[PDB]
Design a protein around this nucleic acid. Sequence first.
DNA 1: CTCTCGCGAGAG
DNA 2: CTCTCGCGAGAG
Lengths: 92, 91
Amino acid sequence: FQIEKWQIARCNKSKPQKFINDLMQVLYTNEYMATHSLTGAKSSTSRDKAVKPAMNQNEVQEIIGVTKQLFPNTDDVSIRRMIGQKLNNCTK
Amino acid sequence: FQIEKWQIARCNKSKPQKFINDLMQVLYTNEYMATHSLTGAKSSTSRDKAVKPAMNQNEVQEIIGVTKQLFPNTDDVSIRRMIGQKLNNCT
DNA sequence: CTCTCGCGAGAG
DNA sequence: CTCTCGCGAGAG
């Protein structure tokens, strides 16, 4: 699993969160992003509810590497939160 | 309100979050940080308990300014989240 | 305390 | 859709 330049060409380059919003939209359906989390962990505030399965960690790490290449001043922890932010803003 | 170099000098320079954690512990008591949020916004979740009041926004901008001088490639909004993380760290 | 991290309101 | 930003479990 390898993100290509033609996928990267379609994505806002002004800001990392904007790049992530565009790239996730190129790679994934809305239904997929609404039903998965970054890590598959239970939310501290979800009691006795379905736990969303994790993204493919190979796809996560490719997403992070491509983002890091275009945004050298963003770091691992920030890009992870940004992928989570996009996933959190998708509804079934 | 101005942050002095003697306060900056007591702080980890390796990572912005470590710097912010050190800097805020030099400026504020644990109990102050325990009981404030960055902006004083009402929780999206716990709507019953009293709302933690905001930090002083002048102090916030002086912290972001001093952070930005040492970590010029960290953006303003990340620094705001890091100030938030450290307040949360005191709860 | 510290970090990571899924979630939510409510206003753009 | 998109952002800011507070809660809070669990492992460290």
